[PDB]
Design a protein around this ligand. Sequence first.
Ligand SMILES: *C[C@@](C)(O)[C@](*)(O)[C@H](CC(C)C)NC(=O)[C@H](Cc1ccccc1)NC(=O)[C@H](CC(C)C)NC(=O)[C@H](CCc1ccccc1)NC(=O)CN1CCOCC1
Ligand SMILES: *C[C@@](C)(O)[C@](*)(O)[C@H](CC(C)C)NC(=O)[C@H](Cc1ccccc1)NC(=O)[C@H](CC(C)C)NC(=O)[C@H](CCc1ccccc1)NC(=O)CN1CCOCC1
Ligand SMILES: *C[C@@](C)(O)[C@](*)(O)[C@H](CC(C)C)NC(=O)[C@H](Cc1ccccc1)NC(=O)[C@H](CC(C)C)NC(=O)[C@H](CCc1ccccc1)NC(=O)CN1CCOCC1
Ligand SMILES: [Mg+2]
Ligand SMILES: [Mg+2]
Ligand SMILES: [Mg+2]
Lengths: 125, 233, 196, 226, 195, 195, 222, 212, 204
Amino acid sequence: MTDRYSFSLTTFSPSGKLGQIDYALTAVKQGVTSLGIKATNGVVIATEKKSSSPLAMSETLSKVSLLTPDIGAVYSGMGPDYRVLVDKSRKVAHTSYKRIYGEYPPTKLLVSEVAKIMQEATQSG
Amino acid sequence: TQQPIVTGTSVISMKYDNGVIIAADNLGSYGSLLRFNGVERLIPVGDNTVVGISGDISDMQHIERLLKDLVTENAYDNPLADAEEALEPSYIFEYLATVMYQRRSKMNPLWNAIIVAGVQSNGDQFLRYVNLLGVTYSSPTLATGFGAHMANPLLRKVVDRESDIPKTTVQVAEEAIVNAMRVLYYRDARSSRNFSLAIIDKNTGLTFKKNLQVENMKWDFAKDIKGYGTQKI
Amino acid sequence: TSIMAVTFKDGVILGADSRTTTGAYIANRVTDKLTRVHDKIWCCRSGSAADTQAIADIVQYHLELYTSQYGTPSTETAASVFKELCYENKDNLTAGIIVAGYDDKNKGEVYTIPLGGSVHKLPYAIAGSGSTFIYGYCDKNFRENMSKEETVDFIKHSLSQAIKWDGSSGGVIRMVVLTAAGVERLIFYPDEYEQL
Amino acid sequence: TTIVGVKFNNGVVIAADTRSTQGPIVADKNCAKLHRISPKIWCAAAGTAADTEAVTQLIGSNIELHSLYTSREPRVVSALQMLKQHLFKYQGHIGAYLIVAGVDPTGSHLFSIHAHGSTDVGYYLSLGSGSLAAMAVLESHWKQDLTKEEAIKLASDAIQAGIWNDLGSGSNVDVCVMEIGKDAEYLRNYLTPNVREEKQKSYKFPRGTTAVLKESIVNICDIQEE
Amino acid sequence: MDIILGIRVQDSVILASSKAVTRGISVLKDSDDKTRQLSPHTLMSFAGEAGDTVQFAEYIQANIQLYSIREDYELSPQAVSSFVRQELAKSIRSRRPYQVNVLIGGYDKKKNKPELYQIDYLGTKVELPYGAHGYSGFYTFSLLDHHYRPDMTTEEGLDLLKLCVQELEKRMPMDFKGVIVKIVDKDGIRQVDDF
Amino acid sequence: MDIILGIRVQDSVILASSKAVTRGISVLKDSDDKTRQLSPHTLMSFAGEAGDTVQFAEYIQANIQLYSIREDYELSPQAVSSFVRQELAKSIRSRRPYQVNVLIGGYDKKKNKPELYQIDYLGTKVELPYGAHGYSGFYTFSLLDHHYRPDMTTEEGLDLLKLCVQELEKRMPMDFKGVIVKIVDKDGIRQVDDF
Amino acid sequence: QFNPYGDNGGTILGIAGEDFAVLAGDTRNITDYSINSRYEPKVFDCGDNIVMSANGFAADGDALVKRFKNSVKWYHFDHNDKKLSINSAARNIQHLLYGKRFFPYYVHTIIAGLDEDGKGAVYSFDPVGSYEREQCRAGGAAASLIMPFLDNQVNFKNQYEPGTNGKVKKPLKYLSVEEVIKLVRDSFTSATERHIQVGDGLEILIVTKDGVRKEFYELKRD
Amino acid sequence: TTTLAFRFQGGIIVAVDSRATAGNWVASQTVKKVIEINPFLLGTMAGGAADCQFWETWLGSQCRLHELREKERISVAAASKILSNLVYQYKGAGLSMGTMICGYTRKEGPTIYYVDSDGTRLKGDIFCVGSGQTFAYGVLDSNYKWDLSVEDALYLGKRSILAAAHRDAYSGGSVNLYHVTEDGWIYHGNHDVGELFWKVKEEEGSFNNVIG
Amino acid sequence: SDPSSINGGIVVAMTGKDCVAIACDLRLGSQSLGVSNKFEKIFHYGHVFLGITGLATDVTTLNEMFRYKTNLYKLKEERAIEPETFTQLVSSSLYERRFGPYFVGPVVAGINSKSGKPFIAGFDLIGCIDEAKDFIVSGTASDQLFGMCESLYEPNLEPEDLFETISQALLNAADRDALSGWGAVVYIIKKDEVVKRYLKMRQD
Ligand SMILES: *C[C@@](C)(O)[C@](*)(O)[C@H](CC(C)C)NC(=O)[C@H](Cc1ccccc1)NC(=O)[C@H](CC(C)C)NC(=O)[C@H](CCc1ccccc1)NC(=O)CN1CCOCC1
Ligand SMILES: *C[C@@](C)(O)[C@](*)(O)[C@H](CC(C)C)NC(=O)[C@H](Cc1ccccc1)NC(=O)[C@H](CC(C)C)NC(=O)[C@H](CCc1ccccc1)NC(=O)CN1CCOCC1
Ligand SMILES: *C[C@@](C)(O)[C@](*)(O)[C@H](CC(C)C)NC(=O)[C@H](Cc1ccccc1)NC(=O)[C@H](CC(C)C)NC(=O)[C@H](CCc1ccccc1)NC(=O)CN1CCOCC1
Ligand SMILES: [Mg+2]
Ligand SMILES: [Mg+2]
Ligand SMILES: [Mg+2]
């Protein structure tokens, strides 16, 4: 009843590749298309609701998620991984920013925090 | 130095156009025990003055005897004892205020708060407070204990300043006093339902009302209150 | 606070006054001190309002989780969970709790848990500041296997006296009846119970 | 502080005075004591000022995350539960005394919570130093089935009683109305019965009145190019 | 007041008393004479609480001077010390006692002998070859236990006293600003001006 | 530990520190150096609770000497004083705080200027032309307010310091057993052996 | 344990002019967070063109004023109806206060009137009777708020002549009665805003050679 | 408070500050801490304001009664001892007084007596008394000699109080100066510290610790 | 014993027409002993000014702390922190020491660079915010400052008039406090120029 995996599961191969990151990018390639376009007075993000069954209620599965009142997110790849990242992204916007400065973080810094969480899953044990 | 043992709670009062009203409940508490249910805490002096007392009841009974003895003493060698040389509210108050401050200055107070209500010879309303420290003050409304916190706000909505006194009738003033006594019964843990009320008017004289009860109480909304948050039944 | 729970022929009845005090100020005059921990297991609360609410919330959680795994808990079990919290945290708590419940097997049961965190199973129980004034009355007037109407009257007369003499008790008399028939809430106002 | 809550036909109203104090001194004459927990859950605060702000913001933050997690509009009972458990854990040391109100899919709600973590339910409530003055008004004029207009009137009258009769309270009346099926309306400075009169004199000084030793420009800009 | 010492030799009694008067943070004076002549052949040194010391010393002085005029006679040192002791023993059970410790050095003209009495604020009297009050005795008694002889001259007594003062100047924390020394013998009381 | 003084003149910093170590009734030592060299051009004097003083001084000394070896460089007086302040400011909210007050006298070789920092046990830092800890400053600051000029020589600084010590020897109750004086300038740290 | 003292709040202010003096006080009386009265007079005409106020613990204040009023009465009886001068009144009050040195009157006392040259006079007392004559004094709960303002506006402290670098002070002047009352009203309006125990009403007693006049002004009631 | 008195070739110098405090509140900057008992006697006040004012004013009355009864000016020794014996009666009751009784008589010459509320009575050439006494002592003891000019001695006394006014939080306001001779006391003016400090800084070149 | 009055000192801030002013005294003491007459209590991080009264070790510690935090803010955000945001940061930082607080009375002052709006705020030792339109006071002579400001202040004062008002408020308040004074500094702050003035005051 021990977590003995204190070592990295992503390592450098002889060619300099980080295999698990490349393989993760391959999983992203298989995922459904999503896009984003920036206008002068706005930004749009969009994707296909690929329904796994017609009996399934696709309204309940939200691929496009509010992170803060002025920030939104969409993905391509593994849906469950996205869902937990949205949970963590919403929380880190409060803990590492709103509870300190009394305002929501700017887009670039919230992105930076999400990026940090994804980097750590690329190096941690 | 002592501690109060058997105690009386709020005394409340106000001025109206032709006189003054004063009231106090009929309870003598022994800490949290509601020990004595027939205690009169409004004590008339002549036909022009009522002294309302809160705090220690043993000290109240002492003060009652002082006032009774004061009437006896005023009658001595005084052919105008029931006329021009009768005791005034202002005389009775100043006497008590002198005693209260003398006793605090010997570090042996009379553990009370007192309101003297009355009407003077010239028809002027008299209403003044004194306590165990000898502190004195007058105002269109006066109240002791919890009454200061709860009765005064209500009574001040009727008479907020001196200029409101002529505009306030005896019916309006009594209504305000009776409502204030109900509010105190809802909210003061050392109060009772039964109370006494006294009106001293310049025209109609002293009217002393005994065995009054708080009535027209609202408890019906209590049936709809369940739990302390999440409980639905 | 004046609280009691009384077993009778068809089950058990809980009773309480509705007063909450801060010093001598009445913070709440319509308090509900009879709280549900399970469908047919309830408690009467006295002592700290914060402590007894915290405890009761934890017990409700424990019995909800018990029910999910093992089915309906006994009244004895509910009393044991209250005890465990009161005993182990005796240094930091001011809680006097009466636990009352109805099983079909055991019928009406009453357990009292005073300050130390001891448990005592009894035919009836009284507690809170106002209970001191009615030990005499309750001992002389309690009988076993009373009817519903008799037990309502016994609690109404008892808490009426507790309210009359205790300044820390007052307001309405709330009651909760626990039988096979279900759960009945009763309320009795001052104009009714003062003239008794 | 004087804070109140009053239930009505289709919702709930809360109100507060605007005075904050430091000893016997008035630190702020236009303090805002109505805190938004979520769009339709608001609360009035009394007690240690820093604690009331910190506690409303923490639970308001966690309520927002809970709302996003569950895809549901926040409930008043959740704010209540999270507030009481936090305050109980700190054994009264966090000096927050709050009246918590709101509307949610379950209906309209009104609660009070004390610093030690006890809560209570009611149709009308008051808290703070002026709570006795406010409760006197509430006990005299409250009835069942109040309209919106009647409840706003009663709530502000109850705050006024605190303003005039309690030295702890003063200045202005702030109100927030939460009605079922509507946006919550925050009415900042709903009453302003305490404007200062004009002063007798102007105290503007002649230029050059104060004696100076040295002057210098302060560099607030960053290190420059070239 | 800090250090008062006494030593009885062959034909005299020597009293040494510190010059410092200190209130809290500051040394207010460095030339204070902590003694009163009670009679021509009897000297009392004193130390204790501020005010009490001088008030008590002058009160005793007045009483002994009164006795001297009334009887036209000088009380023996033993008699003066017994009077002083009784006044202090009376004082200790009063509303506000005198917090004063004293040494009485006298030459008894009847017996032709020097005498030194140590009396504390409680009225505890002892006749001694050498004495001290307060923290002084913690250093000086061991010295005197080593170096004292009963048949010493007055000059030998002064050298032995220099050795006491040197030790107190080395090891005590407070700067007591030196000592005024007075000799009591058959010819009366005189002050050693250079010490 | 009782008296520590500091004065910054034109081209040097002078620190004067008392020699007495007293426990209760007895003066245990009269030649105690209440200072540590932190670096070749930085000296720290110290006073406060027994044990804490030396432990803290030697702990700071070890840390600055470690820095000097690692970087092959001497920290500026300003940098050393900021390090010391932070250690004391950290200390004050600990289980058992360091009850130690310090003066830091240094010569900044970069700016070619003497510098004197006064820091108390709370971590209260000030740069001053002259400084003192404890009861010393109650006497010495008024003197220095009268007699100090910024363009004084080291000899003038030493004479001004003699005037401070004379005043402390006159008016303070405790015998502090004189002072060890040390000068900090461009050439380093040296002790004035006759004072 | 029984505590023989209390705090009734309130604030008072004396200002001396060239041929007049004022003594002002708020009319609010309080205990803890309760208002006892919105109009309870605190400044009193004591006869002989002397006005007095003993602010603090109201029972001790009333007792002291009552004893001083009586002292004036007996001064008339014992010295052939002679007018008690303001300096003599002040020394008498010192003895009244110092008489209770070991059980003090818990008050700050101010008296105002005219001196024997007809010039405006304000005297100020601590609880145990130390006194001083001044051009200015505020006493009571909001004294700390009001006094610095009076130093600045009555005695022209920290004010210099413009253009003199900072070497010629603003020269001292006597203020008119109209100018003094403006400063009194602004002092109390300011104190009422920031002190909870100050409010309800302002009562000013003005003393001239002609006698004692009164003025009353409303203050905020919160 | 800071007060001082010292003896020198040309008589006695007495200098005091003018500040009264209630905790950290500055109650007054214009108090008179010297009492003129008669033309040859001065009293200085430090400690409780009331205690000092009352009992030193009372002392003046007792000195006046002495000269009515004995047809002769009271000695400085006798005047100081009336006050010290009085405070000794009150010992433990909590009076707070630190005083100097300074004067000239033919039989004594110029004399200074320190008297305080715990009962201490001391004759001496130099005394500084009050919260700021240490600061005054620092300046005074360094520049003191027996044979200063009257002009130099007056300045040193003024300068010593200024020093204490600067450093001591509970001293300040102004400096009141007196000079006592064979012929009596002479007042040498009130000197506001707000002007005196800057004057002394410029002329003396002292107070280099301050931004000026 | 009381940490807030060992060292002494005061800070005051005021708003004017398109400007703010913040001022402080220069005293640091150990109760009755004056130690330093150069201990400034106003600091700045870009265009945001912070005054701090109270225990001097905590004044210095908090200056170093907010320099640290605003330096990191600027590196990450790529812009200077604004007064409104800095106020929240002060509050957050104080409240995280709720049960072992810094014994201080901070005062924020500045002009928002985007909106141009004058801004001031004050705090208690555990971080409660008082965001005043008119003025903010702090320190051992706070009662005195409240009295001066409440009478002397009027809205919409020009920079050179506002200088006179704030200076007279500080000076006269300091002279009624034993633990304040010993010099004073006044900052007049406009959208893109800041003037600093040392005041001549009595040195006792
Ligand atoms: C009325 C009754 C007989 O006591 C009965 O037991 C009820 C039962 C409740 C409703 C379940 N108990 C109360 O009303 C308690 C009595 C009590 C007070 C203090 C300690 C234990 C019990 N009242 C409260 O718990 C009260 C509820 C608030 C008003 C919502 N809380 C307090 O009075 C609070 C408790 C602090 C405390 C908690 C635990 C142990 C010790 C103390 N106390 C205060 O706020 C104190 N108050 C004193 C006067 O100045 C204001 C502060
Ligand atoms: C005013 C009111 C009628 O009581 C009402 O309840 C308001 C409601 C708020 C605004 C939500 N309450 C207050 O204004 C509180 C009253 C209070 C004071 C003190 C303790 C508890 C309650 N006022 C404050 O909290 C005040 C806000 C400032 C003026 C912005 N803060 C303080 O007074 C502060 C509290 C410190 C404290 C620390 C630990 C536990 C509890 C409280 N105290 C000081 O600032 C005192 N002092 C600190 C050192 O520097 C000098 C000043
Ligand atoms: C300046 C100095 C260093 O203290 C110097 O010794 C002067 C010399 C005087 C002016 C001759 N002493 C004072 O200023 C004393 C200091 C002191 C205070 C208290 C006890 C002993 C010494 N100041 C006073 O005596 C003070 C003068 C007033 C402010 C004009 N009076 C009080 O502080 C006063 C009486 C104190 C008292 C009470 C009972 C028995 C004995 C003494 N106290 C108050 O007024 C209380 N409080 C009320 C609200 O405002 C703050 C003050
Ligand atoms: Mg109010
Ligand atoms: Mg000073
Ligand atoms: Mg000052």
